Design a protein around this ligand. Sequence first.
Ligand SMILES: *[C@@H]1O[C@H](CO)[C@@H](O)[C@H](O)[C@H]1NC(=O)CCCCCCC(C)C
Ligand SMILES: *[C@@H]1O[C@H](CO)[C@@H](O)[C@H](O)[C@H]1NC(C)=O
Ligand SMILES: *[C@@H]1O[C@H](CO)[C@@H](O)[C@H](O)[C@@H]1O
Lengths: 7, 259
Amino acid sequence: XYXXXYX
Amino acid sequence: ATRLLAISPHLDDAVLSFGAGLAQAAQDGANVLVYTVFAGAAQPPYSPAAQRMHTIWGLAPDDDAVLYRRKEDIAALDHLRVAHRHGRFLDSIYRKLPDGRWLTAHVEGRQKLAVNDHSPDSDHDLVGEVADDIRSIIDEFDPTLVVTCAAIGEHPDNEATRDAALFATHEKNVPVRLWEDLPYAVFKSGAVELPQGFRLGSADVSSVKPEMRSQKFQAVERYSSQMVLFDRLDEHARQNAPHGGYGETTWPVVRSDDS
Ligand SMILES: *[C@@H]1O[C@H](CO)[C@@H](O)[C@H](O)[C@H]1NC(=O)CCCCCCC(C)C
Ligand SMILES: *[C@@H]1O[C@H](CO)[C@@H](O)[C@H](O)[C@H]1NC(C)=O
Ligand SMILES: *[C@@H]1O[C@H](CO)[C@@H](O)[C@H](O)[C@@H]1O
């Protein structure tokens, strides 16, 4: 995992 | 005299997470140095993911994005009247895996980035490198206190920064604290897994004068590239210590029993 955004 | 060493993973994280603590320390006459670990100047070509990030940040995709960031960091920290030190490690988007793959891959549709699967050996090797650099800075600057990130949000660069800082400060006998990573803490649990043998103490929710919040948010706006907000941060802070002002949550880190 990690993963960007912005949410 | 108090010498505060703040260890930021990326160019903005110390100001975003701990800008009011930096501003308060400065105000109190402390000697303050923000060392940013992943401020290494990346050499092109860039990966598809980096090139996409650069364009998201308003840059030509092949532009010197780290140079642009480093200048924003100098602007933001001079606003706070605190020193900078720009370390040599490459941001996740510039790193390669030992098998040649990019560490991070671009993913279509809002997600941006995801990290490539890889062996932990290279993550452990990165920590030892970062820890060597922190030990040298501790020898040179002689901090009375180190503050770095909790790595809430599990960014691999923040986890490496945090772990390296814990090992280095334990070996050097320098107290260390972790700040709550913003904005991640607004939307993530807050629970993290520290390296074996370390544990958090009791949280401190600071209370900062509204003047210190204003100086922090002004310094945040020097990071133009990273913006396209402040309301969210405000509500998180007031939500942390109500009947209270703005503040930032930090924890001391100590050794676990039996370790
Ligand atoms: C996202 O990961 C990138 C690749 O490692 C880093 O360059 C970048 O620093 C990372 N950003 C964050 O962790 C938080 C982004 C939200 C920042 C906007 C805050 C203000 C305007 C500076
Ligand atoms: C995504 O992050 C950008 C980065 O500055 C931020 O300004 C914006 O508020 C975010 N978008 C959202 C939360 O929908
Ligand atoms: C933020 O990230 C996770 C993983 O993509 C989602 O489950 C969540 O709803 C939001 O998209």
